[PDB]
């Protein structure tokens, strides 16, 4: 396994410690992660939307610099908009790219106080809804799918047979669950750090704290470790 870098540990506390709540600590993807933002990684705090729209983006780059499946990431402010704005109100969203060209698509999910994650593995022709709180989500996939079908039969006139398509919720006994009401943020990113690498979710709770730290580091340097 891994162990922490005594000097880079103290370098984290400068990002999470006292100081300005706006002093940008990292930039990229058009997202500026400030103190306030990166602070959401503290023990028991709730990850905001940037600590995610970012890590979720480093996952793409790490999968193009270590060569993993074509990975198409969507923003936190995506599903919601779609949930109420159909496809018409999301058309111009997929600009400069054929979605079906990709292998895997990661879609973060915001239910008011919760972080879920839908993995649309384009290859195997189906999507999986992973939730670290047990909560189920059928209508979520059912809806998302309906985005594709139109993201196709409207953005390429070529329809989509729904038969060859499947979706399903990953049961609590399959993937690891959280044991508190704060960490669901991480559980969603790390679900991607693995699902993205086609690797099996073998991680758990008595490790998350750490995951949190490296994560702030990972984002400082923008180097996924």
């Amino acid at each position: 396994l891994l162990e922490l870098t005594e000097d880079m540990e103290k370098e984290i506390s400068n990002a999470l410690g006292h100081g300005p709540q706006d002093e940008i600590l990292s930039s990229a993807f058009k997202l500026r992660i400030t103190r306030g933002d990166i602070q959401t990684l503290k023990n028991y705090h709730w990850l905001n939307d940037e600590v995610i729209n970012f890590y979720m983006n480093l996952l793409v780059e790490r999968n193009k610099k270590q060569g993993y499946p074509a990975l198409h990431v969507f923003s936190t402010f995506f599903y919601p908009k779609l949930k109420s704005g159909g496809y018409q109100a999301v058309k111009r969203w997929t600009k400069g790219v054929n979605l079906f060209e990709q292998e895997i698509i990661l879609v973060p999910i915001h239910r008011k106080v919760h972080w879920s994650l839908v993995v649309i593995d384009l290859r195997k022709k189906c999507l999986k809804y992973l939730d670290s709180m047990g909560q189920k989500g059928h209508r979520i996939c059912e809806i998302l799918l309906q985005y594709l079908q139109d993201e196709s039969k409207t953005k390429r006139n070529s329809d989509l047979n729904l038969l060859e398509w499947t979706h399903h919720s990953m049961k609590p006994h399959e993937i690891p669950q959280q044991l508190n009401g704060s960490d669901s943020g991480m559980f969603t990113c790390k679900y991607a750090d693995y699902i993205s690498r086609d690797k099996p979710i073998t991680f758990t709770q008595h490790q998350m704290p750490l995951f949190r730290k490296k994560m702030v580091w990972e984002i400082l340097h923008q180097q996924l470790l």
């Binding site: 706006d22 400030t34 923003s75 402010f77 943020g185």
Partner: protein, 75 residues
């Protein structure tokens, strides 16, 4: 000429010339609101309009819509 529909409906019609920063258009909007900027984030057709960003590096169409969303948090 522009618009900045928020997470609701509020149509605050705007206007500026495509060249200079949008950061000025940021503070401007977040001026007449009940909660500051860092509680909001500006998106244009999806991509998140940074501050260093400019309508000139964006290729925005006058009489276009620059949606705005409020922070999200989950745990």
């Amino acid at each position: 000429k522009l618009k900045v529909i928020g997470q609701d409906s509020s149509e605050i019609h705007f206007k500026v010339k495509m060249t200079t920063h949008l950061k000025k258009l940021k503070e401007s909007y977040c001026q007449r609101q009940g909660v500051p900027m860092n509680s909001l984030r500006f998106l244009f057709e999806g991509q998140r309009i940074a501050d260093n960003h400019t309508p000139k590096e964006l290729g925005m169409e006058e009489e276009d819509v620059i949606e705005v969303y409020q922070e999200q948090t989950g745990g």
